[PDB]
Amino acid sequence: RPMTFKGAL
Amino acid sequence: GSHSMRYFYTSVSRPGRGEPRFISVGYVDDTQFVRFDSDAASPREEPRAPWIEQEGPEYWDRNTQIYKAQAQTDRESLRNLRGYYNQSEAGSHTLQSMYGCDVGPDGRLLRGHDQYAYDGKDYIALNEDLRSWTAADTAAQITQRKWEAAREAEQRRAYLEGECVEWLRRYLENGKDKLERADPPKTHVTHHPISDHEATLRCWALGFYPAEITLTWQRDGEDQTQDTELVETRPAGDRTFQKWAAVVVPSGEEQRYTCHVQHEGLPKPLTLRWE
Amino acid sequence: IQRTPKIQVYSRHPAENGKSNFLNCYVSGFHPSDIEVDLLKNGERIEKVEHSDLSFSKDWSFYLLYYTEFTPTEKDEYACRVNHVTLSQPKIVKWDRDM
């Protein structure tokens, strides 16, 4: 299952 | 015996033709098992392998929420990236992301990955240590500084060493009849004259899984790397892969040539000859 | 900077005249991702061709498989026709059952 809460570049 | 899970995200801007499209696909080894497409009539994570269909509706719901949020974040990233490269609003650009984990036969983490490309070029990548970043250029140094201040790597690391490995293990067990099965290549050599004095020998590998294979020709036992035409490994559409390698040989010397095939599905390498 | 597609046209199983099979066109190694692919039977576009979900390789280049059911014969000609920003004209690759 995918990761969540990744930050914008 | 080793396995991997990977998610591949693509966001493509299209000025004058709406907001950027986001698509994600998920793989275990060479098997795609989920997709999401923001251009779908009703965007939702969808199953693309039989062994993932058993996940409950809460699985599909949760992941759909995650992709929708990621799509929005990627839109922000694309705006930021245009500024970092002093680009105008008129051109189309692409942001790609790939991340996931590799585990060994025992299920233990071998390596994590989390990296990005902008317009086809490496942009920033999480290092093998899962604690620090490598930036390709001064624009990506801006992202790196932001992510260092935010301790962004710590959450990537926690996912890669934790959730990633645990869900990969679960998928491998649920899909074990396919994911833990290697199908060896079916092989054969064909021969076609090209003139009175030369012929093509083509060594075929068909129906194999996973995609990793080595196919080589030898003449008198010497590798013919420079003289071999090798096509890219290609999917058959039934989960399996195909490949061939061809050499041009002087007429009557065919028996000097041997084709060698290495694959996980093969206990011992195959040596093949025409007839 | 852009990357032009590699194109292969082939069948899912070794072709046998009169027997149902799948005709595949695999495009790979390209960037950017917009690409148009047709499968052709005797020069005419085959309708309702399916394709895989857009994905990419370790080097970030994209790949896609287009595929359709077909029944090869001695006389019917099959082909793939590919358009991409890197190509001045569509590229046509004919189906050759031993490639």
Domains and CATH numbers, chain C: 1-99 (2.60.40.10)
Site from C9, C24, C56 to mutate, B interface, most B CB atoms within 10 angstroms: C56
Question: B14 and B110 share a domain?
Answer: yes
Interface contact A2-B116, CB threshold 8 A: no
Look up tokens 């061809």; give the residue.
Answer: B246
Q: Which residues pair with B28 in a beta bridge?
A: B5, B31
Distance (Å, rounded) from C-alpha B98 to C-alpha B38?
18
What is the residue type of B147? W
Question: B136 and B202 share a domain?
Answer: no
Say whether B36 sits in a helix, a strand or coil.
strand
Question: B97 and B231 share a domain?
Answer: no
Q: Which distant-in-sequence residues (6+ apart) come within 8 Å of B186 by Cβ?
A: B205, B206, B207, B208
To the question of whether residue B171 is assigned a binding role by annotation, the answer is yes
Question: B22 and B150 share a domain?
Answer: yes
CATH code of the domain containing B27: 3.30.500.10
Identify which of A7, C35, C63, C29 has the alpha carbon closest to the alpha carbon of residue B27: C63
Into how many domains does chain B fold?
2
Question: B85 and B196 share a domain?
Answer: no
Question: B187 and B212 share a domain?
Answer: yes
Our CA angle for B275, B258, B240, nearest 5°, is 80
Residue C84: DSSP 8-state: -
Say whether C92 sits in a helix, a strand or coil.
strand
Identify which of C82, B176, C30, B200 has the alpha carbon closest to the alpha carbon of residue C94: C82
Nearest to C26 among B119, B121, B235 (CB): B235
Question: B78 and B149 share a domain?
Answer: yes
Look up tokens 């077909």; give the residue.
Answer: C70
Q: How many CB atoms sit inside 10 A of residue B119's CB? A: 19
Q: Helix-strand-coil percent breakdown of chain B, rounded to 5? A: 25, 40, 35
Question: B174 and B124 share a domain?
Answer: yes
Distance (Å, rounded) from C-alpha C82 to C-alpha C80?
7
Look up tokens 């833990």; give the residue.
Answer: B180
The domain of B203 spans 182-272
Identify which of C25, C8, C27, C11 has the alpha carbon closest to the alpha carbon of residue C73: C11
CATH code of the domain containing B208: 2.60.40.10
Question: B192 and B112 share a domain?
Answer: no
Interface contact B37-C56, CB threshold 8 A: no
The residue in chain B having the minimum alpha-carbon distance to the alpha carbon of residue A3 is: B159
Are A and C touching by the rule of 3+ CB pairs within 8 Å? Answer: no
Question: B220 and B137 share a domain?
Answer: no
The CA dihedral of C16, C17, C21, C27, to the nearest 10 degrees, is 90
Say whether B51 sits in a helix, a strand or coil.
helix
What is the residue type of B105? P
**Elucidated via:** X-ray
Q: Does B39 touch chain C (CB under 8 A)?
A: no
Nearest to B10 among C3, C12, C56 (CB): C56
**Dihedral sign of CA atoms B263, B267, B270, B275 in order:** negative
Question: B125 and B104 share a domain?
Answer: yes
Question: B32 and B148 share a domain?
Answer: yes
Residue C95: DSSP 8-state: -
Q: Does B15 touch chain C (CB under 8 A)?
A: no
